[PDB]
Design a protein around this nucleic acid. Structure first.
Ligand SMILES: [Mg+2]
Ligand SMILES: [Mg+2]
Ligand SMILES: [Mg+2]
Ligand SMILES: [Mg+2]
Ligand SMILES: [Mg+2]
Lengths: 145, 67, 137, 70, 199, 63, 100, 143
RNA sequence: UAAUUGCGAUAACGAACGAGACCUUAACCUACUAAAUAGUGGUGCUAGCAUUUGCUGGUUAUCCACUUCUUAGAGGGACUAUCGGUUUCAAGCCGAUGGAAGUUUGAGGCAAUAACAGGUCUGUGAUGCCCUUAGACGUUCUGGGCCGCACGCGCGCUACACUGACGGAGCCAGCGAGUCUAACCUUGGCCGAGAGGUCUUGGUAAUCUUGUGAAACUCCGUCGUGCUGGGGAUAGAGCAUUGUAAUUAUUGCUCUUCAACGAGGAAUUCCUAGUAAGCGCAAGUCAUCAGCUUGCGUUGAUUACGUCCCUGCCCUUUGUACACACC
């Protein structure tokens, strides 16, 4: 398409918010590997970062990466709506977060642990390892290993 | 299978038995005459009877048939 | 003057009048029937009898009732039947037979509608003949 | 990430002196003969069709049929 | 040649349809002949068609299938795998692209290439379960050639970069050239191999 | 592979356990004054021509 | 002269046609102007049910149909011979509604 | 030469009217663009963040030109497709009502579409003018 | 022959039921009747383009004429018609032509005699007997359960991808249902990212919802063969709707999490043409809840036109120590 020689300015697999990201995938779907950002969140973040989605994540910039990072850590400050976030009115401060770290699982385990400590039915089911959303357990999910 | 049943075969039999100086070996006039000379209660049955009457006329023209 | 064409449930009504070779399908030209692969199916009743062959007729069709393929077949039958009917009524019986012969020697239901209609579905299975899977043990 | 994602210039002569030895050019041909990945084989063939050696035969979406110029 | 016009402008590429020697929308039919005498009357070139979508009754009678255009029979066999049941427009587009690719590679009249592939890949001797080596009818030969070619193209295009049109083109080209790199030729050779061992 | 073609001049009937094979009286295209009976799998009719990898093997019925 | 429309609905086609033909003949013999009897498509009130009163056996289904046929004839007529043409139609099984 | 919107069928005209609405300078966009999917039955936003609203506008304008008045519900049904409901069967789902309503209001503001006395939006005088101009331009541009 | 269908044969003759006939429906009918509850042309009015009068358009009280499309009454039409071949000797069968249609024209509805200890006493204010009948086994109310999960089985839905997913754009059905003592089907406007909310409107319906602008499909693009942008299970958070009440999540929506699954053993099902398969839609249940069913249409193959090998069925002959009848 054009001169893309870039002998020393192409990057292989990189590091981004405590998560290794492959630079050979287009930026949105390469970004989706961070726990907490899916296809739609990555698309919206990469379009609020003014990044060209048509290029791979390995050549984006050494600055646009941090721009994407900061937009992801502070979504509501870059004009990204509350309903686009995975953690709204979380349980204890009422603020809307979008957990983007190796802390998606931390927030999940905090939710499960508070559900177990309150002795709620969902917490008890989680503790037992059973399904929690009222599915029939007679026939499905038997082995689960 | 297109085997004509007894209710068609005997109806054509009687029609040919009493109306030989009558309707020719053409189906179109045979069915029209059957309309006047027989009280057939359905158009399909009338068509079946007229067609078998025409067939019997055609095979009578090459020699008498049994019965 | 007025003819029609059907394949399964689509009916295409064609009006053929005195004009100068204008062939509309839904207000658009016949070049815009657009399944993008069955356009020659509606070109066929023009390329068969005579490629241009006609600065005297105007054909306007309107098709509703089926699907994309069914509508294409309905219009391709409708304009052929319109040409045949116009030549029968106006031009001459010899030319009507002459073009009817070509249409029928190429017949893909150009003049005679496809008589295949859907078979009703019977209980005990999805579809006319298909039955629900039977188990014994 | 498997092959020929973005770099494709260490033998950048293989987008130019490729036209001989085959008459059929497509996205899949570009992927198959170890030059381009299908991620950008489409834009490579579009580019060298705009200025280059391949002429289009069909040019249909989810397909491409190009041949070398006479 | 005499491209006269009417109110609706229709392109001269379609007005040159039959003033001259007949063809497809792109490909000649009159220069197509069966490679052998056994498969004539069961391959159906000439009649010519403008597209392999002649939605005609070929199943109400035993041998009326033999009078269907062989290109449309190939299209119908491409209409398979279950997920692609129906999808005749898709299969016709695939056939068009396949013929284009065959014309690009060793042009050789892609219709003629297809008929040669069928004639080469029709199994001439099979086995019946009595295990017994029986001969093969010409209609069955044509049907098995089409089935083998389409199935080979399907399983080649499954799970790989190249399209079904390109796999079909490669299969047909290899079969017409009679090479043991094609699925259909390999399967025909295997059937004829274990038929002689069951004579 | 030796070349020989033939043509059904008569269709005898079905054979095989499931009735899938058909017996045909076939006349060789070359030296047309000789007939052999063959077993053919697919659908056949009159004046339809077959290819025989083996030329002379009289087909019997298939019990 | 007032314009009225008579709508006839029934399941029995023969007597519905008897009423529609009585109306047409009465309008002709009273020399009225009438738009012909329009027959709107018959509504097939079908209902699907299971034949068995329990849950055993082959699952055999049963479709019952009520074919309702509908007709409307609108014309212009004065009061006396509109009352007489709405009171001549007392054929059983046909429902008749005259709207002004 | 007596060229109407019904002379270029499906893609050339819509891409050309979308390009014309782009070069007209007036954006008419609500800012929801780049955030929205255009249907609850969709899985991703439109792939081209800039230009999809113009393509929607051109499509709606052509759709209203080809027929009588059209409403937001009709547009939602038209622009909604099948939805992948997971391990459940697909089903038609109506498209986003807000985008269709806002694009109708944008064409109303630019005078391409007006109110119908019986409801919905109908192509206007200058609507037909500009649509037909674009149709003739596309026809003479690409035969 | 599909047929105990017929030719015929003949200690039977003449009949009855079943089959067929019949009825419904799906095919055709430039023929009849008739249609601002269906539609078509041209005049009015009339926006665009083109300007020598033409293309496409709106004009739902804007006229006139007509019924090709549509509708539904009365009818027509097919009777394997005609012509060949072949049948013992016919009944018939096989080809071709014509035909809208030639396999009972396609699909059904109805469907005999004898039976089964087949299911249903949980449809019945059908019902005998037995039991119970005030601390009730009656009835009602609250709450729970019917869904509960080491596991085995049956019907299914979604998939394993490029004959694809995703995004735009193209923009095509048929069968139906729908509220007056009242809350049903909902167009249109507005608000909302969505689900949804709100203000009106039309419809008791060929009139309005609705052309149900269905989905598969088509075109142009992004993806690029990787458990990948296939798949969407599980789970977290939030927003709504129904409902007196959603916790054991009714459902819908948003973001996030992203499991198995790389085409499936032995076995086994359904199916021969507008069929299989794919695709959705309406209706039933229904306040809400489809992965179900009953129908409907859209796209539409391959293979066969046979046989009795398997599993069975019909007739005849034959053997039987079987009659609860080879379990
Ligand atoms: Mg769409
Ligand atoms: Mg019992
Ligand atoms: Mg239960
Ligand atoms: Mg149920
Ligand atoms: Mg025993």
């Amino acid at each position: 398409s054009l001169v893309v020689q870039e002998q020393g300015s192409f990057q292989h697999i990189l590091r981004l918010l405590n998560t290794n990201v492959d630079g050979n995938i287009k930026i949105v779907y390469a970004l989706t590997t961070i726990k907490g950002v899916g296809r739609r969140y990555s698309n919206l973040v990469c379009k609020k970062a003014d990044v060209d989605l048509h290029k791979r994540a390995g050549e984006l910039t050494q600055e646009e990466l941090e721009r994407i990072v900061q937009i992801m850590q502070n979504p509501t400050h870059y004009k990204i709506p509350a309903w686009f976030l995975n953690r709204q009115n979380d349980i204890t401060d009422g603020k809307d977060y979008h957990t983007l770290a190796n802390n998606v699982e931390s927030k999940l385990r905090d939710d499960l642990e508070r559900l177990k400590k309150i002795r709620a039915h969902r917490g008890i089911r989680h503790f037992w390892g059973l399904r929690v959303r009222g599915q029939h357990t007679k026939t499905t999910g038997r082995r689960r290993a | 299978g297109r085997v004509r049943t007894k209710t068609v075969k005997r109806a054509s039999k009687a029609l040919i038995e009493r109306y030989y100086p009558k309707l020719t070996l053409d189906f179109q006039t045979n069915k029209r005459l059957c309309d006047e000379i027989a009280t057939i209660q359905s158009k399909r049955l009338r068509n079946k009877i007229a067609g078998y009457t025409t067939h019997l006329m055609k095979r009578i023209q090459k020699g008498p048939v049994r019965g | 003057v007025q003819t029609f064409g059907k394949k399964k449930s689509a009916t295409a009504v064609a009006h053929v009048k005195a004009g100068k070779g204008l062939i509309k399908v839904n207000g658009s030209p016949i070049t815009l029937v657009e399944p993008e692969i069955l356009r020659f199916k509606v070109y066929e009743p023009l390329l068969l009898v005579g490629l241009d062959k006609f600065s005297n007729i105007d054909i306007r069709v309107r098709v509703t009732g089926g699907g994309h393929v069914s509508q294409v077949y309905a219009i391709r039958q409708a304009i052929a039947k319109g040409l045949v009917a116009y030549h029968q009524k106006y031009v001459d019986e010899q030319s009507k037979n002459e073009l009817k012969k070509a249409f029928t020697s190429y017949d893909r239901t150009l003049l005679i509608a496809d008589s295949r209609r859907p078979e009703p579905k019977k209980f005990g299975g999805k579809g006319a003949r298909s039955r629900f899977q039977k188990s014994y043990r | 990430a498997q092959h020929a994602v973005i770099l494709d210039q260490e033998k950048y002569d293989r987008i130019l002196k490729e036209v001989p030895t085959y008459r059929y050019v497509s996205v899949s041909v570009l992927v198959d003969r170890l030059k381009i990945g299908g991620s950008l084989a489409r834009i490579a063939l579009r580019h060298l069709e705009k200025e280059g050696i391949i002429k289009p035969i069909s040019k249909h979406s989810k397909q491409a049929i190009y041949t070398r110029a006479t | 040649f005499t491209p006269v016009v009417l109110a609706t402008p229709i392109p001269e590429e379609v007005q040159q349809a039959q003033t001259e020697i007949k063809l497809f929308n792109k490909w000649s039919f009159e220069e197509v002949e069966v490679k052998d005498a056994s498969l004539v009357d069961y391959v159906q070139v000439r009649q010519p068609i403008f597209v392999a979508h002649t939605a005609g009754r070929y199943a109400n009678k035993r041998f009326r299938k033999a009078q269907c255009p062989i290109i449309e029979r190939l299209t119908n066999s491409l209409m398979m795998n279950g997920r692609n049941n129906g999808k005749k427009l898709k299969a016709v587009r695939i056939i068009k692209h396949t013929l284009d690719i065959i014309n690009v590679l060793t042009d050789q009249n892609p219709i003629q290439v297809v008929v040669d592939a069928i004639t080469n890949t029709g199994p001439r001797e099979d086995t019946t379960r009595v295990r017994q080596a029986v001969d093969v009818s010409p209609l069955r030969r044509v049907n098995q050639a089409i089935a083998l070619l389409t199935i080979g193209a399907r399983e080649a295009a499954f799970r790989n970069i190249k399209t079904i049109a390109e796999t079909l083109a490669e299969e047909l080209i290899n079969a017409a050239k009679g090479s043991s790199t094609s699925y259909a030729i390999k399967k025909k050779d295997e059937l004829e191999r274990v038929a002689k061992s069951n004579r | 592979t030796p070349v020989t073609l033939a043509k059904v001049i008569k269709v005898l009937g079905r054979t095989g356990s499931r009735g899938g094979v058909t017996q045909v009286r076939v006349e060789f295209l070359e030296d047309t004054s000789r007939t052999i009976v063959r077993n053919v799998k697919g659908p056949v009719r009159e004046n339809d021509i077959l290819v025989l990898m083996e030329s002379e093997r009289e087909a019997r019925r298939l019990r | 002269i007032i314009k009225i429309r008579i709508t006839l609905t029934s399941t029995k086609v023969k007597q519905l046609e008897n009423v529609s033909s009585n109306i047409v003949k009465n309008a002709e013999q009273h020399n009225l102007v009438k738009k012909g009897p329009v027959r709107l498509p018959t509504k097939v009130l079908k209902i699907s049910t299971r034949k068995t009163p329990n849950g055993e056996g082959s699952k055999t289904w049963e479709t019952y149909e009520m074919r309702i046929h509908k007709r409307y004839i609108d014309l212009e007529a004065p009061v006396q011979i509109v009352k007489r043409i709405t009171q001549i139609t007392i054929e059983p099984g046909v429902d008749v509604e005259v709207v002004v | 030469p007596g060229v109407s919107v019904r002379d270029v069928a499906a893609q050339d005209f819509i891409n050309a009217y979308a390009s014309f609405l782009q070069r007209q300078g007036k954006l008419e966009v609500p800012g929801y663009v780049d955030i929205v999917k255009t249907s609850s039955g969709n899985e991703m936003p439109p792939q081209d963040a800039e230009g999809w609203f113009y393509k929607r506008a051109a499509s709606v304008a052509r759709h209203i030109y080809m027929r009588k008045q059209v409403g937001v519900g009709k547009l939602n049904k038209l622009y909604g497709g099948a939805k992948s409901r997971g391990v459940r069967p697909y089903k038609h789902i109506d498209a986003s009502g807000s985008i269709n309503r806002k694009v109708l209001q944008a064409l109303e503001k630019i005078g391409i579409v007006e109110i119908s006395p019986k409801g919905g939006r109908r192509i206007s005088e200058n609507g037909q003018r500009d649509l037909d101009r674009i149709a003739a331009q596309t026809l003479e541009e690409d035969e």
